[PDB]
């Protein structure tokens, strides 16, 4: 098994909807423990954790220099996508139309 990435993540480019209707976040890893398992979570409008919304199976960083695509299935309305662990976690707001 991989160890959970202990480092920080940043956005490589704008978060966007995919051809199949999911939401893709492409991240650039800033740590030094790759290959490592990406911590991921989703939150509702109130910042409360909601499970089962990660589409990508077992997202990993294999090389710190290579960005990683991560897809989520957010709920309609306001929510957050969170990449990484701790307070340093990359927290992205998302609004899903209709």
């Amino acid at each position: 098994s991989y160890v959970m990435c202990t480092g920080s993540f940043k956005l490589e480019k704008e978060v966007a909807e995919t051809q199949h209707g999911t939401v893709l976040v492409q991240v650039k890893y800033e740590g030094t423990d790759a290959p490592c398992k990406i911590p991921f979570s989703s939150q509702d409008e109130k910042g409360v954790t909601q499970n089962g919304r990660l589409i990508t199976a077992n997202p990993i960083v294999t090389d710190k220099e290579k960005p990683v695509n991560i897809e989520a299935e957010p709920p309609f309305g306001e929510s957050y996508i969170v990449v990484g662990a701790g307070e340093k976690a990359l927290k992205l707001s998302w609004f899903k139309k209709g």
Partner: antibody
Amino acid sequence: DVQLVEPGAELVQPGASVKMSCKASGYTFSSYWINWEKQRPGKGLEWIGNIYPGSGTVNYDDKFKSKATLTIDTSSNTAYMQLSSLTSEDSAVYYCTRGGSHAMDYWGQGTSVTVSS
Amino acid sequence: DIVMTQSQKFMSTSVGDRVSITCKASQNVRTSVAWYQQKPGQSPKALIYLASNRHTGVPDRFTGSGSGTDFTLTISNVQSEDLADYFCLQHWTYPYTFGGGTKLEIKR
């Protein structure tokens, strides 16, 4: 009559690059995604990546990240794919196709790339 | 990445029979599976979308079924124009991946 026209073939020297086109007609170009695929005899079809003409959103299969570049010319309803530093492993039929929530529906005629000196 | 397995590279049939072509996903892809028909020197033609929906113009001989990992393209009353290559595609997540194909041939 939705159509996607690609040139029939391209002969490329080993180490050179190639740029191929996909011209769409019969539908609103900016309302649908474009997919690019690689088909070689003996090997399963591969998805290279996709691009959304209205926004410029682009996604790649990591297997083709160093090889392919997907661009657009929305004023002429055309999608482009550029392949860099070609080897014999790059000889294949390259298809473009219209996409969306229901996946590829209409496929182009394919561009046959031959890598040879 | 998701792997789409078509265990049968070739299948033999007779005109008027039923043939079932299988496609197995390596993970749960729900119903995000399309089926395509391809003849030599021609571009693929879309047959089924979202596992079980028939594209406009496609004969009712063609039906798709399954959800999760096990998908099947069923061709009832096989016609000689149905002799072709058939392949599946998952579009549940990137990268999209295709089955290796199954070629339908005539028994003699």
